[PDB]
C-alpha cells in the first residue's frame, strides 16, 4: 500500500550477489513518479559523519542516527528493496540535500 | 590518466553513460554522477535522445542517474554530449529530484 514520497526517510534492503543488510535513505523524488516506475531517487544515510561537505545532518528529534550523503543519490527499486517508512525529514533538511546535490549535478 | 568530466559520454564496466558531475569532483573522489545510455528507446517520459553520428547511439535514461565508482569500472571517454542534450537531461532529472 505504501508509496514513498519526497522527504520520507525509509529503510531499504540490500543483498549481496555472492554469499547485505538494511540502511536508511532519504527519498528525493515524488510519489507521483515513484508510483509509476517502482523506482525512486534516494540518498543513503551513513553512520560515519566525517565533516565531508556533502553530508547533511539529521536533527535528533527525528530519531535517525547518521548523516545523509547528498552526493550519493541513486535510482533504486523501492518495491524489491522493501521500502518501509521510518520518519519524515523537515523541509530545510530536504532543501540542503537538494541544494548540494543540484550544485554537483550542474543544475542552473 | 583519464578523469571523466561533465557532459562526457563514457564507456563503463561495456555500456555507455552520460557524466553529469565535473572533473574537479570526479578526480578527487573517484566517484561520479552519471546516467546510463540504452539502445532500447521506448518513448517513456525520462528518455533523452542522442543525435545521430555522435559516436554512440540510443537514449539517456535521465531518471536512472546514480553515484558510482568510475575507476573500478574503468571509465573510457567515447564522445562529448551536445549542450542541448546535457541541458535536457539536467532539466528532466532536476524536476524528478524536486529541484523545480
Amino acid at each position: 500500500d505504501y508509496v514513498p514520497d519526497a522527504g520520507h526517510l525509509v529503510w531499504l534492503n540490500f543483498t549481496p550477489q555472492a554469499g547485505g543488510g538494511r540502511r536508511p535513505a532519504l527519498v528525493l523524488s515524488p510519489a507521483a513518479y515513484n508510483g509509476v516506475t517502482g523506482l525512486m531517487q534516494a540518498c543513503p544515510v551513513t553512520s560515519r559523519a566525517k565533516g565531508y561537505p556533502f553530508e547533511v545532518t539529521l536533527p535528533a528529534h527525528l530519531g535517525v542516527s547518521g548523516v545523509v550523503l547528498a552526493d550519493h543519490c541513486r535510482s533504486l527499486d523501492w518495491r524489491s528493496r522493501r521500502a518501509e517508512q521510518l520518519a519524515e525529514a523537515p523541509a530545510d533538511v530536504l532543501a540542503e540535500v537538494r541544494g548540494k546535490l543540484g550544485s554537483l549535478l550542474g543544475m542552473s | 590518466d583519464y578523469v571523466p568530466d561533465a557532459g562526457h559520454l563514457v564507456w563503463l564496466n561495456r555500456r555507455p553513460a552520460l557524466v553529469l558531475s565535473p572533473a574537479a569532483y570526479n578526480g578527487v573522489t573517484g566517484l561520479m554522477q552519471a546516467c546510463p545510455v540504452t539502445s532500447r528507446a521506448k518513448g517513456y517520459p525520462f528518455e533523452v535522445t542522442l543525435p545521430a553520428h555522435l559516436g554512440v547511439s540510443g537514449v539517456v535514461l535521465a531518471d536512472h542517474c546514480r553515484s558510482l565508482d568510475w575507476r573500478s569500472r574503468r571509465a573510457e571517454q567515447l564522445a562529448e554530449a551536445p549542450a542541448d542534450v546535457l541541458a535536457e537531461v539536467r532539466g528532466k532529472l532536476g524536476s524528478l529530484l524536486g529541484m523545480s
Binding site: 517502482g38 523506482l39 561537505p53 550523503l69 550519493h72 533504486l76 548540494k100 554537483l104 | -
Partner: peptide
C-alpha cells in the same frame, strides 16, 4: 550552493567510498 565552495572543503580523510547497495534489484538499470 556554490560547487567550488563545497569541493574546497573535501579532504582525503573525509572522503566516503561508494555506498554499497548490493546486487541489482527489480527495475534498476544498473
Amino acid at each position: 550552493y556554490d560547487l567550488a565552495a563545497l569541493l574546497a572543503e573535501m579532504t582525503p580523510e573525509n572522503l566516503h567510498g561508494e555506498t554499497d547497495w548490493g546486487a541489482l534489484e527489480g527495475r534498476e538499470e544498473w
